């Protein structure tokens, strides 16, 4: 099995493999694409565990997250993720001709909207000693939601371009949706914590507020589904 | 022989545990390399029939069994990893079977999510909108489309009374439980867009589609525009 | 002037011409009350009365108004199948409408109706009027068709599955059409006021869109009724109401005014 | 006497028309009065139906701009001097017409009480969700919490206070309740065979705060305006902006 897989890798041609594959049945190929994607997730959850006290650098986690960004489609349910002013969809990172996401956007094939992932460390507070949420947070939510804002205005100002060429006369109208990985959800041994920081997260307009232990837990929950 | 057979093996195994074992401790461009390779075979295995029948073939089932062959590309493309075509639950490739018989069973205990999507397949010569204008410029949807619409909604809304039901009856039991209500997401595939060829066409189709609240409607050209795209990614 | 020096001296006189069904002084004064050049001064006098008085009159008038419109309908709801009489019907009595849907502002058939009368502003464009309007930018858009409108398709998609019909559909298509056409041209204001160098807020009026449509007796079968409530429930901006309900809501409230 | 009389105004409706003109005989008060205290009423009612429709109207609009004026000048007239809650809730209560055309709703709740029309809707059982599930004039509803003008707003950059967060989550409880029997009341009708759609009611919260002039500074006003734009459910409205809007209408119906 090792040495097959080696050479699948490792081959002059392959187009000549891709031809020789497609002679397979469908369900063969399907249940290989499960058994890969049970491995790649399996080998994050690894990955998580062993760097899950010690790494205290947002680089490290968000580096990370953006080389398994098909976790996060299919956790919160859209194929197309940005982070940092980049867009992947199917994993792969999708390259505009020019200097401007948008463009991409308002042009983009496989879906009409998008999700707004923040990333920070495990190691970010939560809540400051009822009882208000720390500073690390507030300012997350905040960058996100003017992104968000300059995203719909530009979206805006192209729509209305398109329509005074001619083109259309319809409207399009782009809503992402917020995501905000916060950090531990465990610290909150007390109950006045749990509450205050539930009763934060019920208030969010437009944010959702993740920890990692959630995360990793719904990371958990898909391998057992896919396995099952 | 060194290639399909060894695949045929690894498909065919007893325990698939020692399977994804050793995938596990391989490098991870190797892993990524196959994967891609993969991914790409059975894009093009799709798109490749698609291209041989988009001219002829006019049987709703032979599309539905098309597509039902291929529920993990649908799982990608939606981005959901359960994926519910005429009562049946696939779950990344292979069809779940209840030992109870009901599918909300199976729902309720779902370990990732108790979401899942509803896709109502069509065939790529159904008509979208009448041929005879309502008025000037304006044209109404054609009722096959209203009549798919509604059939989805009527299974959706089965789906979340029998799970309300199996939550009353978990409550009175005894166990303490949460009233919210499921919402499971509605696709529809109609036919073809290239079809409206006069602004006032798509524009009534476009005014009829964007009003929907909880339905998708999409239409085979722009399901495998997205496929070209996802192969164009791949390489 | 005598007249006057008269009336000064007796009460039953002004009581028993008030009385009287011959003279019609109250008819006279009514229309002299609504065809005065002066609003300002009659409404003066109308805010200086007792809230009493005021509450009373306005029940008695809208009491009357209400029972008209409902007098029409009973006449009428068997007969007539022309759109063009309920549209001038309903058109007759807006203020009704809008304290149906609780907006000042109603556009029928390309036309604005604020006060129970017809807005003839000097442009000729609408958007202008409805761009300068002190209260708020939207406005309900009100479709209008006849009580023998069919609501679903007579034969079945599937076993107990009816697909709404293409009238329903054409009306909700033509009210989206013309809300898109409203929005684009306001738009269109909005930056040309930008390029003057006027600070615009580039924000998108949401007006309301109401489509009329026959009688719920119809749907007999629970298969009909499941049909047409998850076509109904389905969209997203439009409001569908039949004559029933409309009429059923009138009813209502006569007798919440009566009571 | 009244023959003569009769007779007279019919000779010349000129008569008529300066009796009512002239400012020294109260002839429109004197009529109006005996339009509202006459014994029978529905023969008034009788009589008033056979006016046209389009002056009916005229006049429903005619008492509409009076009743909008009066309430303006009882809020020009006790801004500054009273301070009671229950004098401004009296206040809003009975002018509920006016709240629902600024809300565009036309069902007000306010303090476990139903008005439509300006009419308080009575219930037969003690349940306002029973009548909420059988309404006949919409869907949703209007919460509204009346506070006091003299409510503080801001804390002492800065924060919201304590008497708006704390209206805000009793308005939100509320409407957690209210949505929660909603559902039940709906299941069982469900469940005893009368029908199978979903009837999900979302209601409009409204939080009537103090005044909008003690935001002085512009650190008060970006606190505050950026408390407003990022609460999810509520809609936070001062006495202020609440009689511009009256005073808009009043120019708009004019």
């Known amino acids: 099995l090792e040495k097959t897989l080696e050479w699948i890798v490792t081959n002059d ?55 398994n960004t098909w976790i996060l489609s299919q956790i919160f349910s859209n194929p197309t993720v940005l982070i940092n002013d980049e867009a992947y969809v199917g994993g792969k990172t999708v390259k505009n001709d020019s200097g401007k996401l948008v463009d991409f956007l308002y042009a983009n094939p496989f879906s009409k909207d998008a999700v707004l992932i923040e990333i920070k460390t495990p190691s970010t507070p939560l809540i400051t000693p009822v009882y208000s949420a720390h500073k690390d947070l507030t300012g997350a939510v905040t960058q996100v939601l003017t992104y968000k804002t300059t995203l719909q205005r530009e979206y805006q100002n192209i729509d209305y371009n398109n329509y005074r060429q001619g083109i259309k006369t319809d ?19 007390d109950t006045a914590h749990r509450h205050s920081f539930e009763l934060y997260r019920k208030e969010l307009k437009n944010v959702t507020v993740i920890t990692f232990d959630e995360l990793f837990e719904r990371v958990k929950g898909l391998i057992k589904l896919l396995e099952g």
């Open 13 to 67: 041609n392959p187009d000549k493999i891709i031809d020789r594959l497609k002679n397979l049945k469908e369900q063969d190929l399907d249940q290989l694409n499960t058994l890969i994607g049970i491995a790649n997730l399996k080998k994050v959850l690894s990955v998580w565990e062993s760097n899950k006290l010690t790494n205290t650098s947002e680089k490290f986690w968000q580096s990370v997250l953006k080389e």
């Open 171 to 189: 409207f399009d109208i782009i809503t992402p949706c917020c995501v905000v990985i916060a950090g531990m959800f465990d610290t909150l041994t």
